[PDB]
RNA sequence: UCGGCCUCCGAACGGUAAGAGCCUAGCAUGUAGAACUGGUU
């Protein structure tokens, strides 16, 4: 069966469509991915870790064994 | 390790007449597992609708198992038959039912009652309805008859309280002054309203119902002769005899239109007390309402 | 004026040697044996 | 200004219509640079559609209500993003002449599968109250 | 109308939505936060659809149809790159010719550094930096007007 | 006037205890509800 995913997304009310320059789209994808990896980190309450911008995971301070 | 509360997924929500609104054509929205129950904390099928024109978009709060257990509305948390708080109905009928407060015991008890209901016919508020056969003691005196739509009124605009509602007349929230925050009527815990513990609305209605002596009578020094006013020439001694025949044997039944009083006396003290309590501003015979007092 | 440096963020010091002066592993310690309170590079760059 | 994707010669009547769109574009830049703090979540997208609507209306006012511009430059202004083709095609219908947005007649966007209530005519409002559309800020576009 | 299809709205709408929700720090956009986590389940697909539609070296600016979430949580490229095979092979052959000519003729080819931006340099806004600047030239082998007519 | 055959390739856990609770963060909800006084021996 075919089961087109993007047509199923476009059938709902939570998705919209437009036309866009590709560089803006790539910047949007990178910004969205960085923002939500920070959201996952803050969801797990790991405030002593830090994501870069170039997606380099680093701790802020020295870690205890529980951290 | 394989016990957990099952998710209650069902259609056809159980609501009051007042919260349902007044239009016969209602547009209705359903989420399968949208929110959690406000009491038993299980996920349940969430129903949301607008009851009318300028209402609040009321939605269901408690699950169907809790509402079928206590025979209340899913939104108003008031009784389906009478429109009263469940503390008032428990004071009227029975207060020995109770429910656990700790979350594991509450989930276990709710799972047991859910399994009991699912092993039953499906729509029955356990044996408590079997304890609810005796009625009209005093709860019918203060029960509402008209649909009180003012609790479907929209919320107070908090920006207008600070005087910054820039929407103006476009704002659907109420641009009026709120209630007094110092008033103890404004606390209103939802779990306290469900469990019937120290609800101030229930205390205020119990104080209001206690100040109405609709079943007191006994204003005579061991005399069974009581006078029912408001009868007049419309109600005769035949209606008084038919009312006193349910109590057994009546010593004397008469009606006088000069004072518009029906004199009723019984040979038994309990039958005369029941006849005085039934005719104390609650009896209507032949189009005439009677209020029982000393005569 | 950004001068970010990709550090190695695993300071492999023996915590038993660092605040006691004695390690139960001895010469078979996985980490290095040193007792000092100097700040790391990421702690300096964060401050 | 706007970087042209065609990279060819613009058509003949461009030079007397290009400043107005340009300052309309500057208005669009204001709609991209307003601070979102204070209004609402849905209020900050309210001017943008309207500004776009205004832009499309201007090209509509050059081509059908006045017939004062060529066909190929109208196609060029469609292809350069200055006008919406679908909004223009909805505007040529009978009952949809002052349509606020294409989103606001989309029957898949509402809960009950209906239109918005700014498509309801004002004589059949029957509820009172000042109505402003949550999608686009419209107040009775029918 | 029996039914109306979903049409396209201007890119300033999604540009304003991505301009808001800035690093999810505001309390106004709290309710979208859970939705912003749900894109772990679908950004491998967004990476695939974005990276298959990267512009060719003879293109300066390529515009794509974009299907995006209403809260700006995700942005898929909703197209498949279809090409005619002899045109594509001839375009890459012309690319090969100008690359060989450029490496023969340039005195000092310099590689661009990697990564192009630092780890604390914030990602550039498209409207403030890229939307209002003229793009540079593509590769684009010039053709004979007589022979390659 | 007589030959070509060319594996690899790095990361995690495995070590720098565990519990505890006092104020503290982050994060969830945008809620259900305000009923009040009248009859003759
Ligand atoms: Zn109700
Ligand atoms: Zn429940
Ligand atoms: Zn207001
Ligand atoms: Zn050691
Ligand atoms: Zn609209
Ligand atoms: Zn509308
Ligand atoms: Zn409209």
Chain D: nearest CA to A22, how far in angstroms? Answer: 13
As a CATH number, domain B225-294 is 3.30.70.330
User: How many other C-beta atoms lie within 10 A of the C-beta of residue B130?
Assistant: 9
Residues with C-beta atoms within 5 A of ion ligand 1: B 15-16, 19, 73, 75-76
Q: B271 has which bridge partners?
A: none
Nearest to B230 by CA among B170, B279, B175: B279
Do A16 and E68 meet the contact criterion of CB atoms below 8 Å apart?
A: yes
User: How many other C-beta atoms lie within 10 A of the C-beta of residue B71?
Assistant: 19
Chain C: nearest CA to E117, how far in angstroms? Answer: 10
Nearest to A57 by CA among E34, C10, E117: C10
Spans of all domains in chain D = 1-142
Q: Which of residues 98 to 117 on E have a Cβ less than 7 angstroms from any strand F atom?
A: none
The DSSP line for C1-47 is ------------B-HHHHTTS--SSGGG-SSB--------HHHHHH-
Assess whether B199 (CB) lies less than 7 A from strand F: no
Identify the helix (H) or strand (E) that includes residue B7: none
Question: How do the residues of chain D divide into helix, strand and coil, expressed in percent and rounded to 5?
Answer: 40, 0, 60
Experimental approach taken: cryo-EM
Residue tagged 């803006």 (tokens): A24
CB-based burial label for E126 (10 Å; 0-12, 13-18, 19+)? buried
E114: chain C residues, CB-CB within 8 Å: none
The DSSP line for B159-226 is HHHTT--TTGGG--SB-S----TTSGGG---HHHHHHTSS-HHHHHHHHHHHT--SS----SSS---E
Q: Is B15 left (phi over 0), alpha (psi -120 to 50) or beta?
A: beta
Nearest to B282 by CA among B233, B209, B213: B213
Assess whether C32 (CB) lies less than 7 A from strand F: no
CA distance C43 to B119: 64
Q: How far is CA D56 from the centre of its chain?
A: 5
Do B286 and B239 meet the contact criterion of CB atoms below 8 Å apart?
A: yes
For residue D102, the CA-to-ligand 5 centroid distance in Å is: 7
CA distance B71 to B86: 9
Decide: helix, strand or coil at residue A58. Answer: strand
CA distance E13 to E15: 5
CA distance B228 to B237: 12
Between CA E97 and C1' F5 the distance (Å) reads 35
Structure tokens at B125: 């508020």
Structure tokens at B104: 């594991």
Do B47 and B30 meet the contact criterion of CB atoms below 8 Å apart?
A: yes
Pairing state of beta strands B43-49 and B28-36? antiparallel
Q: Is the peptide bond before B102 cis (omega within 30 degrees of 0)?
A: no
CA distance E15 to E138: 27
CA distance A15 to D103: 12
A16: chain E residues, CB-CB within 8 Å: 6, 9, 13-14, 67-70
CA distance B13 to B60: 8
For residue D6, the CA-to-ligand 6 centroid distance in Å is: 34
Who's near E29: CB < 8 A, 6+ residues apart? Answer: D41, E20, E21, E71
Data resolution in angstroms: 3.1
Nearest to B131 by CA among B100, B97, B86: B97
Strand F, nucleotides covered by protein (CB < 7 Å):
15-19, 26-41
CB-based burial label for B44 (10 Å; 0-12, 13-18, 19+)? buried
Chain E: nearest CA to C47, how far in angstroms? Answer: 15
Do E31 and E73 meet the contact criterion of CB atoms below 8 Å apart?
A: no
CA distance E128 to E149: 41
Decide: helix, strand or coil at residue E76. Answer: strand
Structure tokens at D50: 């309207």
Question: Which chain A residue shows the shortest CA-CA distance from D109?
Answer: A13
- Ligand with smallest separation from the Cα of D134: 6
The count of residues in chain C is 47
């Amino acid at each position: 069966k075919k089961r087109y995913l993007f047509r199923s997304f476009k059938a709902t009310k939570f998705f919209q469509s437009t036309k866009l320059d590709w560089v803006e789209v790539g910047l949007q994808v990178c910004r969205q991915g960085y923002n939500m990896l920070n959201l996952l980190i803050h969801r797990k309450n790991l405030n002593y870790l830090h994501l870069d911008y170039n997606f380099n995971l680093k701790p802020v301070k020295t870690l205890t064994t529980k951290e | 390790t394989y016990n957990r509360q099952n998710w209650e997924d069902a259609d056809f929500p159980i609501l009051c007449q007042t919260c349902l609104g007044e239009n016969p054509y209602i547009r209705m929205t359903k989420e399968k597992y949208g929110k959690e129950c406000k009491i038993c904390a299980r996920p349940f099928t969430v129903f949301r609708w607008c009851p009318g024109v300028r209402m609040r978009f009321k939605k269901t709060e408690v699950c169907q198992t809790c509402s079928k257990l206590k025979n209340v509305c899913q939104t108003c948390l008031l009784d389906l038959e009478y429109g009263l708080p469940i503390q008032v109905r428990d004071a009227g009928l029975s207060f020995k039912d109770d429910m656990p407060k700790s979350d594991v015991n509450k989930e276990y008890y709710t799972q047991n009652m859910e399994r009991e209901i699912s092993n039953s016919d499906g729509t029955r508020p356990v044996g408590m309805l079997g304890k609810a056969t005796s009625t009209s003691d005093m709860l019918l005196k203060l029960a509402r008859t008209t649909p009180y739509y003012k609790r479907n009124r929209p919320h107070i605009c908090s920006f207008w309280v600070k005087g910054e509602c820039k929407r103006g007349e476009e704002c659907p929230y109420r641009h009026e002054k709120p209630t007094d925050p110092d008033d103890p009527l404004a606390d209103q815990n939802i779990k306290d309203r469900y469990y019937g513990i120290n609800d101030p609305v229930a205390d205020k209605l119990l104080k209001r119902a206690s100040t109405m002596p609709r079943l007191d009578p006994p204003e005579d020094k061991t005399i069974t002769t009581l006078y029912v006013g408001g009868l007049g020439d419309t109600i005769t001694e035949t209606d008084l005899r038919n009312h006193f025949y349910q109590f057994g044997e009546i010593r004397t039944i008469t009606v006088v239109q000069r004072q518009q009083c029906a004199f009723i006396q019984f040979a038994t003290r309990q039958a005369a007390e029941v006849a005085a309590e039934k005719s104390f501003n609650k009896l209507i015979v032949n189009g005439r309402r009677l209020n029982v007092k000393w005569g | 004026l950004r001068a970010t440096v990709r550090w190695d963020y695993q300071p492999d010091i023996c915590k038993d040697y660092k605040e006691t002066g004695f390690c139960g592993f001895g010469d078979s310690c996985k980490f290095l044996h040193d007792r000092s309170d100097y700040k790391h590079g990421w702690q300096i760059e964060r401050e | 200004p706007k970087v042209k994707r065609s990279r060819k010669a613009p058509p003949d009547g461009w030079e007397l219509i290009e400043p107005t769109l340009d300052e309309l574009d500057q208005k669009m830049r204001e709609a991209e640079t307003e601070p979102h703090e204070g209004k609402r979540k849905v209020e900050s997208l309210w001017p943008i559609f309207r500004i776009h609507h205004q832009k499309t209306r201007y090209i509509f006012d050059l081509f059908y209500k006045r017939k004062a511009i060529s066909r190929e430059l109208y196609e060029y202004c469609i292809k350069e993003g200055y006008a919406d083709k679908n909004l223009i095609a909805k505007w040529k219908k009978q009952g949809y002449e002052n349509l606020c947005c294409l989103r606001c007649i989309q029957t898949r966007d509402t809960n009950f599968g209906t239109n918005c209530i700014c498509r309801v005519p004002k004589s059949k409002l029957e509820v009172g109250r000042i109505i402003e559309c949550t999608h686009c800020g419209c107040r009775g576009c029918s | 109308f029996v039914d109306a299809q979903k049409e396209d709205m201007p890119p300033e709408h999604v540009r304003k939505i991505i301009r808001d929700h800035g690093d999810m720090t505001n309390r106004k956009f709290r309710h979208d936060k859970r939705v912003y986590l749900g894109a772990l389940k679908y950004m491998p697909h967004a990476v695939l659809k974005l990276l298959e539609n990267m512009p060719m070296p003879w293109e300066q600016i390529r515009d794509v149809p974009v299907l995006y979430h209403i809260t700006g949580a995700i942005s898929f490229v909703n197209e498949i790159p279809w090409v005619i095979e002899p045109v594509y092979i001839s375009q890459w052959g012309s690319m090969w010719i100008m690359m060989r000519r450029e490496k023969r003729d340039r005195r000092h080819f310099k590689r661009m550094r990697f990564p192009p931006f630092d780890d604390e340099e914030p990602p550039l806004d498209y409207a403030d930096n890229i939307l209002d600047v003229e793009p540079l030239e593509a590769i684009q082998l010039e053709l004979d007007p007589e022979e390659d007519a």
